């Protein structure tokens, strides 16, 4: 039997770890940028550091449904970027938290110590997000958020405009929900490892 990258147990494990990291990061961004009120969040521990978890069931289910779709894309190494876009009441983008991801074309079948230094890496990103409010101006009241995903274009590109994954429909975002005229770029953290390279930065409206 011939195996593809996604068939590797290691690929599935890393995808699970990274998908959960994105969930923790999204919750934290929503908290520190006050997209949702502080009242719905509760302090919890992840990667041995304090994090903030929404206790609103609807929002939690939405975030899980969204990110569950990214999991298979991660296993196949087709994800290039996952972005959390914060928009004002005028539907204009005010901040964008960009998570760039690269993974090797394969992972070892000798899964021995696959996740040995991964936690320290994820922890560093969470800590940077935790204090990001110190380098950003407060957002206007009434903001909302959208999650954007960029993948690598394969051979037989799918031309379908409404692509469904795990019973969740996705569509192409419009220029309005993304375009920012020469925004301020703020690097947060860039790290590498044998199983992943990730770069997080924020784009802030001028």
């Amino acid at each position: 039997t011939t195996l593809t990258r996604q068939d590797l147990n290691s690929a599935q494990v890393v995808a699970d770890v990274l998908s959960e990291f994105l969930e923790v990061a999204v919750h934290l961004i929503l908290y520190v940028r006050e997209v949702y009120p502080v009242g719905i969040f509760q302090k919890r521990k992840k990667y041995n550091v304090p994090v903030q978890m929404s206790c609103h069931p609807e929002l939690n289910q939405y975030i899980q449904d969204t990110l569950h779709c990214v999991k298979p894309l991660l296993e196949k190494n087709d994800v290039e970027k996952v972005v959390v876009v914060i928009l004002d009441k005028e539907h204009r983008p005010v901040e964008k938290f960009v998570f760039e991801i690269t993974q090797p074309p394969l992972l070892s079948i000798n899964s021995d110590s696959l996740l040995s230094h991964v936690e320290q890496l994820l922890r560093a990103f969470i800590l940077k997000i935790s204090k990001v409010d110190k380098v950003l101006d407060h957002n206007p009241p009434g903001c909302t958020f959208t999650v954007l995903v960029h993948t690598r274009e394969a051979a037989t590109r799918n031309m379908e405009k409404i692509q469904v994954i795990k019973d969740f429909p996705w569509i192409l975002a419009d220029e309005q929900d993304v375009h920012m005229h020469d925004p301020r770029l703020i690097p947060l953290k860039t790290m590498t490892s044998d199983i992943l390279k990730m770069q997080l930065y924020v784009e802030e409206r001028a």
């Binding site: 949702y36 009120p37 719905i40 609103h56 609807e58 929002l59 939405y62 449904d65 969204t66 290039e80 970027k81 972005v83 909302t144 958020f145 959208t146 999650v147 954007l148 995903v149 960029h150 993948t151 690598r152 274009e153 590109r157 409404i162 692509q163 969740f168 429909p169 996705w170 569509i171 192409l172 975002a173 929900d177 993304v178």
Partner: peptide, 22 residues
């Protein structure tokens, strides 16, 4: 590259939003 792709379902508000299928 392909994207940016976004969920067709918008993020939920604290209390449910209005009826507007299109």
């Amino acid at each position: 590259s392909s994207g940016p792709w976004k969920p067709a379902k918008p993020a939920p508000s604290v209390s449910p939003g209005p009826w507007k299928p299109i």
